Amino acid sequence: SNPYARGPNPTAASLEASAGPFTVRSFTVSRPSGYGAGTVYYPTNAGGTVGAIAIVPGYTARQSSIKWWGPRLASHGFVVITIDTNSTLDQPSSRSSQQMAALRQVASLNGTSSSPIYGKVDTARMGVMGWSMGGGGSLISAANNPSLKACAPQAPWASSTNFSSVTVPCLIFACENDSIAPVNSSALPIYDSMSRNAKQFLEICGGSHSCANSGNSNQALIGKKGVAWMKRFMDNDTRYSTFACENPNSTRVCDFRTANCS
Structure with a gap:
């Protein structure tokens, strides 16, 4: 039996729906430790400890841009x-440091009896996500901390597209007509650089x-894929x-690639 399996058996419909099976609550982090601000979303009735995911926005951007992932x-x-960075103009390496600081604080709060997430987290199972430079930061976090169980950046940008060292399962969401971090020069080269992991490339x-x-x-599609990736690799489910x-096999997908996955 898998000790990390939570919730009922999944279907396409259950994964495409607005919400999964568990009730969600949230709170604002009162004293952010090593990053600007944060909102923590958590299930009240998951039926066991769960993994933690930290999500970072892009350059100039704030939590509003990636908030939907929380619930x-x-x-x-x-x-x-979901975090705001110390400065909206922080670069990918700084975003990675702040993402890991946010994971650290979630682990701290897991051991804080006054926190709503007291005892709800398995601090040994963590994942990283983010948009654009925050996606680059997620890949840097994965390269520097291989015990991370999953990485699912969106429209990533990074100074170097070479993530050949990454062993963490990586799902790259790409946006076909992206003019800031074009697919051909950012998402696709990043994807192609990784030969040591489970990986996927999904272009909208x-x-x-x-x-x-x-x-x-x-x-419906993006949420299904993000949840499925985190479930498979953070929970070994x-x-x-x-x-x-x-x-x-969706008309919403213009390019799909996967390797070392099934």
Whole structure:
């Protein structure tokens, strides 16, 4: 039996829905430790400890850009922290440091009896996500901390596209018509550099740079894939192997690639 399996058996419908099975609550971090600000989303009734995911915005951007992931992932059995960086103009390495500081604080709060997330987190199972330079920061976090169980950046940008060292399972969401971090020069080269991990490349048809952000028109597919990836790799949950590894066969997807997945 898998000690990390949570919730009922998944379906395409249950993964495409607005919400998963668990009730979600949230709170603002009162004293952010090593980053600007944070919101923690958590399930109240997951039926066991769950992994934690830290999500970082892009250059100039704030939590509003990636907020939708908080309730979406938390409702399937994860503690999710969305952050604002110390400066909106922080670069990817700094974003990575702040992302890891946010994971550290979630672990701190797991051991703080006054916190709503006291005893709710398995601090040995963590994941990283983010938009643009925050996506680059997620890849840097994965390269520097290989015990991370999953990485799912969106429209990533980084100073170097070479992430050949990354052993962490990586799902790259890409936006076809991205003019800030073009697919051909950012997301795709990053994907191609990784030969030591489970990896996936999912490009959204007609998507601008913000195609996986809050308010996007593809929350059914993007949310299904993000949750499935985190479930498969953070929870070792093989009930999600097909959802995580499959080509969605969706008219919303203009390019799909996967390796070492199923």
